[PDB]
Structure prediction request, 130 residues.
Amino acid sequence: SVSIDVEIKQNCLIKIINIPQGTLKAEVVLAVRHLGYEFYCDYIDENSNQINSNLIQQDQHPQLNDLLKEGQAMIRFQNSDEQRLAIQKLLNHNNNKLQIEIRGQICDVISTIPEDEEKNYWNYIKFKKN
Prediction:
């Protein structure tokens, strides 16, 4: 009803991988949104990533595409309940890992963003944009 305080959204955040060649965040957004909502989505590559050694991958050795550009997209809804709604849809008959094809390409989508990530992304965008 009414709260003297204010609270942000939790479920309204998610992460997706399998970045399609060239395909920008627009196609990632268009694919996700077409579902059931209009939620602000932004794509971002790994943050301050380290570096790898040439192109070789031992047993516990880093991979070549360490500090690669464009790899996953972030999506934010104006409501947690909504985000959920969009979730319950993709859910389907059984749980399993959500999957979506964006811009005619198959990309992996995860509807779970922990506090660490919520705060990171929120503040991130609020830091890059503000």
User: Anything to note?
Assistant: The longest strand covers residues 105-110.
